Design a protein around this ligand. Structure first.
Ligand SMILES: CCCCCCCC/C=C\CCCCCCCC(=O)OC[C@H](COP(=O)(O)OCC[N+](C)(C)C)OC(=O)CCCCCCC/C=C\CCCCCCCC
Ligand SMILES: CCCCCCCC/C=C\CCCCCCCC(=O)OC[C@H](COP(=O)(O)OCC[N+](C)(C)C)OC(=O)CCCCCCC/C=C\CCCCCCCC
Ligand SMILES: CCCCCCCCCCCCCCCCCC(=O)OC[C@H](COP(=O)(O)OC[C@H](N)C(=O)O)OC(=O)CCCCCCCCCCCCCCCCC
Ligand SMILES: COCC(CCO[C@H]1CC[C@@]2(C)C(=CC[C@H]3[C@@H]4C[C@@H]5O[C@]6(CC[C@@H](C)CO6)[C@@H](C)[C@@H]5[C@@]4(C)CC[C@@H]32)C1)COC
Ligand SMILES: CC(C)CCC[C@@H](C)[C@H]1CC[C@H]2[C@@H]3CC=C4C[C@@H](OC(=O)CCC(=O)O)CC[C@]4(C)[C@H]3CC[C@]12C
Ligand SMILES: CCCCCCCCCCCCCCCCCCOC[C@@H](O)COP(=O)(O)OCC[N+](C)(C)C
Ligand SMILES: CCCCCCCCCCCCCCCCCCOC[C@@H](O)COP(=O)(O)OCC[N+](C)(C)C
Ligand SMILES: *[C@@H]1O[C@H](CO)[C@@H](O)[C@H](O)[C@H]1NC(C)=O
Ligand SMILES: *[C@@H]1O[C@H](CO)[C@@H](O)[C@H](O)[C@H]1NC(C)=O
Lengths: 173, 119, 1420
């Protein structure tokens, strides 16, 4: 089922990016009328201003020219029980860097009860000129390579050793 | 529903007559749903007059024919719906009926007592 | 005494009383061949015509003094009596009592009583009898009164020793008759229970049916061995129940409470004014369809309340409130559940949901000790007990036979047209081998032609099957009628198989001719039984036939009582709870309609008794406890459990041993015909060799040292232990890397990359390891070794996955799917751990047998599944409403067309089929597997018994009596196939044992070297009595601590500690908690007191006795638990840690075992079993792990319908192992399978965008789901049977060997002084003729009394040249007589020889020429 994933944090300038925000309901079986607001603070400024609000399978996108187009909903489709509020940002420009508050507003619909939860997720986004390969990737690659090499070295060492040994042995008789 | 009453009850004029009625219903007695009606008919083919009814409490209709001589004398939670007729008079002779519903028990109970007044 | 027959006369009586007087004036056993009830000995021959059935003088001379007399039946039956005048009124000579005896001893009378009992049973079965049943019960009371009057008038009431009342069963008759009298003549009241007491009439069966008393006696005596194993089961259930009470106390009460209570309400003001389960829902969280709140938990790994709902502890336990851990009582009940594994899946998924998933460890321990160990101890002892009887009886039986022979022998010593032409033609035309092969292949073809049925059969196929069954009936009929006229009609009907065939062809012609539309199972299933004629040749199906024939044969009387029992309990249930249900149905089924399993009818009562017999008693018990109170219902259901399961188990073991008696029932000579099929086999082999030769004839007519150095090198580097250990390390790490591949893997976006690169490193290492082994062993040696093949295959799959990944051909369908085959990677570890290797090669050596006993099982279940398909074939298509899931009422929407019209005019209505139905022999096999495992059987049954037609809305119970089908199926399959299976398995696990030389199968070498010492520990008994130390006061202290008094007082103190530990309960007052804490304080200080006393006295030696070490461990653990829990309570907070620590106090409870020899020996057998169970547990953990990886891989994004909750969902190696442990005991696999079986998108949605992840599609693959689950069930079943065999072997072993050790040194010194008086030269050589006085000159225990030569020749003593013998061989030969055949014998033999060769090197004078026995054989 649903799995809370943290979004990526860097976007490659002049390309596209996908801001994940997954707010799984605690109990899958229940139902709700989720609707979300996304607000964002450009790195360097101090204010959280709304960019989009997505209720009832329509993305009312705010008039900020920092996002005139360039964004479309990649979140749950045609369900009105959203549970996946990720948006897609085609054409990541340098102004898309900063902080993103993904406000969810769930109305859990129950037996005789309408709870109205407000979950908030926040994301840090850096617009980079070129995709920096993640440190874990390169560290893991270097580790694998040095480990392979040292393992073959240890093996061939023990090999040459036991071979010299058994060779002295077979020439002894 | 099993309802236990005496088919005939013989009482001396002027004495107190307890009309016993208990009922074997397995379900617990919920006072918010339990129903009891006590009625009175002079004969099997005569009109019934309700004189006491339980609806979330006790309801005594104070029929003129009984004056204020009717009293409840039971305990519904203990499956007892008996009534008391104080200082019995000759005109009290007749048929008395204990009707009982104990939801969600499906079947309605009915007890019938023939009260006879002795000299 | 062949002429020992004199009418009992007054004169004889006179002599009797005279001899009594002679005995009484001066102040042997009854011969077991002249007792009453047996058969008359033959020495008497036949009875004179007049003397039979008349007072005869008592024949046993044992009673020759007492006033007793016999009367013999015309069937030569014996009946004791008492010659005292009956009731001081009726002399044995009064013609009244005379004819009384006359009528008592007969065969008309027993049949009379038995027929009356059967009619009375039939009348009991009715629940609401009509009016005339009053007169019928009058008649039955009359017959009982009359027969009891006959008996009491004949044999006297109690006025004599041999009399009515002394008969124990006659007490039951007396009770029956007096209760009938009362119930008829007093109108006591509350008759609902009095009426029940007349069911004891049905017990008089046991008195009347000839030969049941012995069977009930056998069962009663088979119980008396369940003395220890019931003490122990009560004790283990109690300890585990105190544990459960200490951990989960009040846990199953958490309920997801609301969070926005308005109107200033609170939890209490609500929990007071709240009664209806339609109102609880407004304030709690009830799942869409259910009748409880949603159990939640405060931890993070427990369940989860939906948002706006807090987890609070209030309300009413789950399941009508009956099952929980709030009180020790309910703890014991829930643990009886969890032991009998009876719907324990719900206790599992309820505690794990409330307490937390971490507590699965508790269940692992409970199911492995309590469920697995106890059921095996039971199955052990009864078996052993039962086996004992067989031996004895069979021994005794053959003994009597010998006597009969000798008895016989004593007597012998004392004596000292063209119609016939045609008939011959056809009898030759029925050519045994060829027409036999024809019949057999036609039988198999008819079966495989009926199996070609499915539900939506196009009419073409249907008429094909029609004419096919026509032609097959024709062929079978033709051949049977031919065989009939071939021989004499009499000769035809002589052989049983021909009666079978004739009956079947009769039925076939019946329903062909008459075209019975009302019944289908009348024919369409009975033509199937012909498949049994394969028993001719098949030597395994023949074993199933012999098992069944036993069940209705020799070992059939036992089966009878089972019927009786399953009847009696049945009608008991119908009389106690009968009216109670219909009266209280509104409580147990909100619709005010009887539940599916009531006891308001005799049929349903028998259903529920059968259900509780096959191991599903709990749901019906909750309903019955809700209606008829917790008082009667528990008594009834526990009585049913114990009695019925005991009888079923004795029956099962009886059939098992009687079939395994194949060694004892093998007395047949060479078969009159080996195999008529084999005749044709040989003949066609002859023909094929002939045609081979002819065709070959016609065809011929028509026409560098360094390399071996390197290999030795690699051999070294691959055998070198460091390399093996390193390889196992890499294997374990690769399996871990598999385990991390959850659904959350996308969240851990660093572990993902590390694991990817580590998979690369691992496949590289394993390729290098493969190459090393290659260069070392060589392809020839390598590919020979199977383990090497599994490694090769799995590393090749890894390699191809790697190359497909690096090339970039990922996501190309199969390759992606191929990644899931990566899950077979842990299996590479199977070859490194010798435990798993030895268990696996054991099971692989046992596969062949289960191939035959699975082929017979598959044929049998195919018979049952075609029988099924014929009855239930798309009659499951209900027209449910999906909103709630309630089958529409058959009053509307009768025929499917209406269901579709309703769909068109409305919504949420689906012409829905079951998922495991009988639509074709395929799904038939699956549903039969379910019904045979009782997991889902209930849904299959309900939807079947509602069947109406091919497509019609099923009515509520329109075909009720098809329950019978299931029960009969169950029995055979689940109680005969299994039986048959078990048979060969033990035989197999015996043969393999004999194959290895009595060795234990499931143990390594090292485990066995441990095992031998663990056996040494058992029955050591060299124990030194500790010496009384030197101090005045220490004096009295030791004097105290050694008497039995002090120890028994400590034991009773421990028992009181138990009873003060269990008296706690959920919600108890604060005051009671404080006083229990103080009582526990006093118990702690007192146990520490006794420990300090033992220390003061025994000093160091305290730490000698292991049990004292356990005592010290417990007392330290206990005072720790006290102080530490105090510190928790005061300093820290977390209650979970607190309770799990306080749990440590139960050590003192455990300390009880010391006293019971009986409890100890059992669990000592356990601790000597633990090695084998560890290897099997390792293997089972590999299999569970491998299946868990597949679970996470392909069953992760399945829908969540039933058994796949938010929890328990194959979404993590934690939850996946939860579910796999659930279905390891076969529990609940129906539910886990149900959502996987959705494929098409009215049940699933194959474009379901899983948020966060990217794996579209939320419905699993059925063709892999059923494979997964069936394979895991079968593997679990095999591994569990291995476990059962291990423990039963250990139990059979501990009991057989009992041993002590004698040892004395002074015996050697007396042997030396007696040596000098006969050997003055100290030559160590004595004469054999002089040894006759030597051996009679020793002192005890070495003394042997004359005549000594009788035993000296049997000792096998060697003799050196000159009729002379050494000193050592005599000294050891005498040593072996006193010490015995112990392991120290051959060890002591070595040391005495090695010390002698070092002192006397002259071996030339030691060479023996013969022995004591071989020389005497030369003399004789
Ligand atoms: C051949 C003979 C075979 C054996 C036959 C006899 C065997 C057992 C007889 C047991 C008799 C039990 C009598 C109980 C009397 C009773 O009515 O006591 C009441 C208690 C407590 O009820 P409560 O006040 O909480 O009611 C509140 C209702 N609420 C909580 C559900 C909402 O009920 C309880 O503790 C339930 C006690 C359950 C005890 C376990 C039963 C034994 C199980 C296995 C034994 C091994 C076989
Ligand atoms: C929830 C419950 C929480 C509380 C539990 C508290 C207690 C738990 C653990 C304490 C363990 C303490 C150590 C136990 C073994 C002590 C020991 O010293 O055991 C030795 C025996 C072999 O020594 P022996 O008896 O031949 O000594 C010769 C003297 N003689 C023959 C005269 C008797 O080894 C054996 O069988 C070992 C058998 C060990 C079985 C432990 C099972 C614990 C459960
Ligand atoms: O079997 C018979 C022999 C067995 O040879 P061995 O295992 O070296 O003997 C070890 C033993 N201790 C010894 O001292 O005697 O060995 C034999 O002669 C039987 C036939 C073996 C045939 C295959 C040998 C393959 C050797 C490796 C070939 C090249 C493999 C290349 C793999 C890819 C590149 C690494
Ligand atoms: C006549 O003398 C025979 C003697 C050899 C006796 O070997 C015995 C070994 C134990 C063994 C295999 C035997 C009989 C009952 C068997 C038990 C019956 C129960 O059945 C099971 C399995 C099937 C379940 C339905 C019920 O429980 C097991 C738990 C129980 C069982 C299989 C445990 C093992 C028992 C035979 C040699 O004498 C020279
Ligand atoms: C010996 C084996 C092979 C069979 C044992 C069968 C018994 C377990 C059956 C037969 C008679 C049944 C009993 C018939 C009568 C009663 C009395 C009954 O109690 C009452 O009726 C009380 C009535 C009242 O108090 O007014 C409780 C069930 C019980 C014990 C039944 C329990 C189940 C019994 C003992
Ligand atoms: C003998 C054969 C034995 C085979 C044993 C195979 C290896 C058996 C190794 O078992 C341990 C793994 O299951 C741990 O991995 P998990 O991913 O379940 O736990 C970590 C969870 N976090 C870190 C993601 C939260
Ligand atoms: C541990 C040693 C095992 C010894 C015995 C060998 O059994 C190995 C099983 O674990 C193989 O797993 P499966 O692939 O059969 O499991 C899932 C079934 N399917 C559906 C994926 C095929
Ligand atoms: C997400 O958005 C992109 C861009 O519109 C779209 O092409 C893609 O199909 C979407 N994917 C999902 C999973 O909805
Ligand atoms: C951000 O970039 C846009 C062009 O994409 C530009 O119009 C705008 O002025 C920039 N804002 C700032 C603060 O530099």
């Amino acid at each position: 089922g649903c799995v809370e994933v943290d979004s990526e944090t860097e976007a490659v300038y002049g390309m596209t990016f996908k801001i994940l925000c997954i707010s799984c309901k605690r109990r899958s079986e229940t139902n709700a009328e989720t609707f979300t607001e996304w607000t964002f603070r450009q790195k360097g400024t101090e204010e959280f201003v709304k960019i989009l609000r997505y209720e009832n399978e329509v993305l009312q996108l705010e008039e900020d020219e920092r996002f005139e187009g360039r964004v479309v909903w990649n979140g749950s489709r045609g369900t009105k029980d959203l549970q996946d509020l990720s948006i897609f940002i085609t054409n990541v420009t340098y102004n898309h860097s900063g902080d993103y508050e993904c406000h969810v507003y769930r109305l859990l619909f129950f037996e005789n009860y309408e709870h109205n939860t407000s979950v908030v997720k926040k994301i840090h986004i850096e617009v980079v000129d070129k995709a920096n390969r993640d440190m874990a990737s390169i560290v893991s690659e270097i580790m694998m390579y040095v480990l392979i090499v040292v393992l073959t070295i240890w093996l061939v060492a023990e090999m040459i050793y036991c071979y010299k040994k058994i060779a002295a042995a077979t020439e002894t008789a | 529903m099993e309802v236990t009453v005496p088919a005939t009850l013989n009482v001396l004029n002027g004495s107190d007559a307890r009309l016993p009625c208990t009922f074997n219903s397995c379900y617990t007695v919920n006072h918010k749903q339990f129903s009891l009606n006590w009625t009175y008919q002079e004969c099997n083919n005569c009109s019934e007059e309700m004189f006491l009814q339980f609806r979330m409490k006790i309801i005594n209709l104070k029929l003129e024919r009984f004056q204020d001589r009717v009293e409840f004398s039971g305990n519904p939670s203990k499956y007892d719906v008996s009534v008391m007729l104080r200082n019995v008079q000759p005109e009290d002779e007749g048929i008395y009926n204990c009707y009982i519903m104990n939801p969600p028990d499906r079947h309605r109970g009915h007890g019938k007592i023939h009260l006879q007044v002795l000299m | 005494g062949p002429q020992s027959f004199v009418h009992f006369t007054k004169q004889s009586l006179a002599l009797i009383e005279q001899r009594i007087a002679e005995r009484k004036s001066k102040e042997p056993k009854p011969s077991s061949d002249l007792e009453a009830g047996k058969q008359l000995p033959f020495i008497y021959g036949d009875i004179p015509p007049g003397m039979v059935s008349e007072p005869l003088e008592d024949l046993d001379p044992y009673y020759a003094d007492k006033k007793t007399f016999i009367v013999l039946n015309k069937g030569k039956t014996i009946f004791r009596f008492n010659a005292t005048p009956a009731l001081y009124m009726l002399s044995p000579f009064s013609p009244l009592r005379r004819i009384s005896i006359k009528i008592l001893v007969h065969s008309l009378f027993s049949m009379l009583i038995m027929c009356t009992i059967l009619t009375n049973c039939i009348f009991m079965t009715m629940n609401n009898p009509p009016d005339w049943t009053k007169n019928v019960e009058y008649t039955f009371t009359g017959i009982y009164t009359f027969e009891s009057l006959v008996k009491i008038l004949a044999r006297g009431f109690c006025v004599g020793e041999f009399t009515f009342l002394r008969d124990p069963w006659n007490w039951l008759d007396f009770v029956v008759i007096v209760f009938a009298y009362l119930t008829e003549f007093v109108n006591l009241g509350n008759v609902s229970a009095l009426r029940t007491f007349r069911v004891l009439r049905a017990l008089k069966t046991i008195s009347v049916i000839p030969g049941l008393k012995t069977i009930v006696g056998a069962l009663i005596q088979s119980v008396k061995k369940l003395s220890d194993v019931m003490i122990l089961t009560v004790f283990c259930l109690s300890v585990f129940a105190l544990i459960g009470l200490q951990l989960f106390m009040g846990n199953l009460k958490h309920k997801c409470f609301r969070n926005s209570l308005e109107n200033n309400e609170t939890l209490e003001s609500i929990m007071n004014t709240l009664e209806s389960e339609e109102d609880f829902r407004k304030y709690f969280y009830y799942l869409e369809g259910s009748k409880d709140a949603l159990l939640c938990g405060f931890s993070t790994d427990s369940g989860q309340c939906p948002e706006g709902y807090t987890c609070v502890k209030i309300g009413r336990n789950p399941d009508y409130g009956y099952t929980s851990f709030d009180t020790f009582s309910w703890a014991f009940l829930a643990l009886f559940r969890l032991m009998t594994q009876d719907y324990w899946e719900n206790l599992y998924q309820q505690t794990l949901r409330a307490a937390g998933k971490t507590y699965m460890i508790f269940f692992v321990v409970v199911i492995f000790l309590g469920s697995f160990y106890l059921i095996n101890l039971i199955l052990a002892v009864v078996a052993m007990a039962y086996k004992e009887q067989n031996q004895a009886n069979i021994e005794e039986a053959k003994q009597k036979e010998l006597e009969f022979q000798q008895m016989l022998d004593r007597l012998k010593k004392e004596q000292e047209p063209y119609w016939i032409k045609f008939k011959k033609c056809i009898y030759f035309i029925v050519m045994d081998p060829f027409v036999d092969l024809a019949i057999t292949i036609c039988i198999v073809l008819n079966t495989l032609f009926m199996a070609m049925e499915h539900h939506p059969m196009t009419e073409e196929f249907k008429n094909v099957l029609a004419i096919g069954n026509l032609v097959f009936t024709g062929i079978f009929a033709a051949e049977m009628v031919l065989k009939l006229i071939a021989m004499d009609p009499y000769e035809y009907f002589q052989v049983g198989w021909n009666i079978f065939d004739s009956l079947i062809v009769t039925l076939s012609l019946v329903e062909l001719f008459l075209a019975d539309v009302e019944g289908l199972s009348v024919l369409r299933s009975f033509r199937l039984l012909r498949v049994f004629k394969l028993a001719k040749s098949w030597p395994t199906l023949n074993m199933l036939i012999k098992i069944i024939g036993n069940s209705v044969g020799a070992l059939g009387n036992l089966t009878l009582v089972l019927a009786i029992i399953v009847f009696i309990f049945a009608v008991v249930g119908m009389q106690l709870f009968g009216k109670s249900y219909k009266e209280c149905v509104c409580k147990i089924n909100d619709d005010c309609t009887l539940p599916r399993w009531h006891m308001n009818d005799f049929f349903h009562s028998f259903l529920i008794v059968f259900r509780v017999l096959c191991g599903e008693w709990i749901e019906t018990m909750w309903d019955c406890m809700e209606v008829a109170g917790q008082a009667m219902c528990l008594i009834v259901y526990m009585m049913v459990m114990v009695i019925g399961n005991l009888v079923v188990l004795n029956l099962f073991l009886a059939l098992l041993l009687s079939s395994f008696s194949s060694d004892n029932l093998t007395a047949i000579e060479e078969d009159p015909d080996a195999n008529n099929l084999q005749i044709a086999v040989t003949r066609i082999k002859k023909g094929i060799n002939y045609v081979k030769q002819t065709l070959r004839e016609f065809i011929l007519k028509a026409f560098g040292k360094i390399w071996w150095n390197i290999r030795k090198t690699c051999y070294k580097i691959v055998e070198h232990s460091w390399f093996e250990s390193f390889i196992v390390l890499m294997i374990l790490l690769s399996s871990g890397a598999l385990a991390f591949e959850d659904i959350y893997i996308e969240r851990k976006k660093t572990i993902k990359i590390i694991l990817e690169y580590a998979d690369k490193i691992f496949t590289y290492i394993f390729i290098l390891e493969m190459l090393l082994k290659w260069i070392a062993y060589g392809y020839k040696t390598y590919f020979t070794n199977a383990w090497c093949w599994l490694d090769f295959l799995i590393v090749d799959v890894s390699l191809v996955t790697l190359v497909a990944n690096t090339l970039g051909y990922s996501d190309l369908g199969p390759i992606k799917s191929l990644r899931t085959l990566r899950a077979l990677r842990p299996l590479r570890a199977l070859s490194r751990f010798e435990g798993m290797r030895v268990v696996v090669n054991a099971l692989i050596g046992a596969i062949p047998s289960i191939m035959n006993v699975l082929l017979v099982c598959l044929i049998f279940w195919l018979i049952f599944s075609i029988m099924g398909v014929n009855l239930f074939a798309g009659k499951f298509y209900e027209c449910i409403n999906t909103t709630d899931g309630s089958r529409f009422p058959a009053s509307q929407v009768p025929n499917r067309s209406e269901c579709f019209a309703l769909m068109n005019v409305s919504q949420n209505v689906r012409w829905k089929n079951l998922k495991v139905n009988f639509d074709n022999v395929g799904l038939g096999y699956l549903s039969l597997l379910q019904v045979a495992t009782f997991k889902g059987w209930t849904i299959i049954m309900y939807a079947a018994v509602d069947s109406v037609n091919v497509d019609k809305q099923p009515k509520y119970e329109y075909s009720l009596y098809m329950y019978i089908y299931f029960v009969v199926f169950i029995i055979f399959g689940s109680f005969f196939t299994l039986n048959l299976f078990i048979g060969v398995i033990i035989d197999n696990f015996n043969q393999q044992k004999k194959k290895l030389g009595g060795q234990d199968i499931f143990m390594t070498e090292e485990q066995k070297k441990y095992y031998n010492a663990m056996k040494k520990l058992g029955s050591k008994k060299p124990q030194k009595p500790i010496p009384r130390p030197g101090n005045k006061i220490q004096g009295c202290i030791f004097d105290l601590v050694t008497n039995q008094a002090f120890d028994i007082s400590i034991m009773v103190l421990i028992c009181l500690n138990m009873v003060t530990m269990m008296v706690e309960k959920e919600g108890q007052s604060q005051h009671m908690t404080e006083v229990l804490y103080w009582i526990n304080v006093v118990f702690i200080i007192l146990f520490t007191g006794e420990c300090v006393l033992k220390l003061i006295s025994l000093r160091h030696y305290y730490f000698t006795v292991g049990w004292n070490i356990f005592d010290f461990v417990v007392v330290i653990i206990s005072i720790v638990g006290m102080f530490l829990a105090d510190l928790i309570e005061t300093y820290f907070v977390s209650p979970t840690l607190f309770r799990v620590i306080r749990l440590a106090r139960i050590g003192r409870i455990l300390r009880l075992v010391k006293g019971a020899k009986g409890i100890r020996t059992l669990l000592f057998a356990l601790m000597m079993s633990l090695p084998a169970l560890f290897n099997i547990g390792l293997l089972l953990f590999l299999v569970m792990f491998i299946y868990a990886i597949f679970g996470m891989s392909n069953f992760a994004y399945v829908k969540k319908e039933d058994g796949i909750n938010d929890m328990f969902n194959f979404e993590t190696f934690g939850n996946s192992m939860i579910c796999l442990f659930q279905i390891t005991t076969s529990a609940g696999w129906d539910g886990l399978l149900a959502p996987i079986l959705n494929s098409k998108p009215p049940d699933c949605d194959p474009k379901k965008v899983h948020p966060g992840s990217s794996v579209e599609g939320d419905c699993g693959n059925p063709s892999v789901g059923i494979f997964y689950f069936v394979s895991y069930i079968i593997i679990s079943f095999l591994v569990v049977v291995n476990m059962y065999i291990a423990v039963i072997l250990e139990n059979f072993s501990v009991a057989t060997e009992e041993s002590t050790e004698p040892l004395s040194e002074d015996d050697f010194e007396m042997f030396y002084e007696v040596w000098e008086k006969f050997d003055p030269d100290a030559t160590q050589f004595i004469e054999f003729s002089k040894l006759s006085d030597f051996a009679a000159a020793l002192d005890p225990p070495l003394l042997i009394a004359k005549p000594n030569k009788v035993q000296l020749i049997a000792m096998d003593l060697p003799m050196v040249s000159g009729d002379r013998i050494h000193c050592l061989d005599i000294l050891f030969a005498f040593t072996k007589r006193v010490l015995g055949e112990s392991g120290e014998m051959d060890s002591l033999r070595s040391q005495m020889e090695e010390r002698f060769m070092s002192a006397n090197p002259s071996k030339v004078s030691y060479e023996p020429i013969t022995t004591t026995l071989k020389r005497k054989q030369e003399d004789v």
